[PDB]
Amino acid sequence: EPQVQFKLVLVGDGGTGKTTFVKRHLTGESEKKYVATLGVEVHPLVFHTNRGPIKFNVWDTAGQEKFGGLRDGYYIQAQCAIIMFDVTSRVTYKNVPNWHRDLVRVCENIPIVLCGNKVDIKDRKVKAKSIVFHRKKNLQYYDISAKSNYNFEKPFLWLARKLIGDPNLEFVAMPALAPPEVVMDPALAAQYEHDLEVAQTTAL
């Protein structure tokens, strides 16, 4: 059996929590591969689905996004992507369209998930009502908190369903993750989820 795997590029402004996020997956971290020419770590993240293992080879930068766009080689042959921003920093959301542009310039219409990270932080700045980019671009959106594992699996499950072409694909179990470093209040989580539902009904 040839293993099913996908190159996933993880992009977004410096400081949004991309590295923290990819590192939640323990085996992905222990089996990560360094790519010296591009200054990239590729984390092989296996998920066990009802139709067998799927591997997302996640490309994480070494911080170079702080200084400009990423090189073509970073994006090349990506089959899917996650664009991350930080819900405590509005400018990171303002830069989402730039990331999307740079991405599609090299990769075109691959499946993409937009993730708003750091929702564990009480003083949230970018709320559901303001999160709109995905609605206009065909993209799926999730709130996440890398530090608490909140919604960790969501982007990967949505991408798996899209790539495989199976809307009923399920993960059999969560991968082994680093234990939460901060607690994600279940009440706040419920509220945030509801706020997104409300926002989805708004016109434009």
Binding site: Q5, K7, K33, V35, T37, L38, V40, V42, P44, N57, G73, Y74, I76, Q77
Partner: peptide, 27 residues
């Protein structure tokens, strides 16, 4: 005769002598 880069895991064509992504040579 496609091959998987052992450095970055990208799949390359048989035509390619080095990885289209990371520039590593084919074994």
């Amino acid at each position: 005769g496609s091959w998987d880069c052992e450095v970055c895991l990208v799949q390359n064509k048989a035509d390619s002598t080095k990885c289209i992504a990371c520039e590593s040579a084919k074994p």
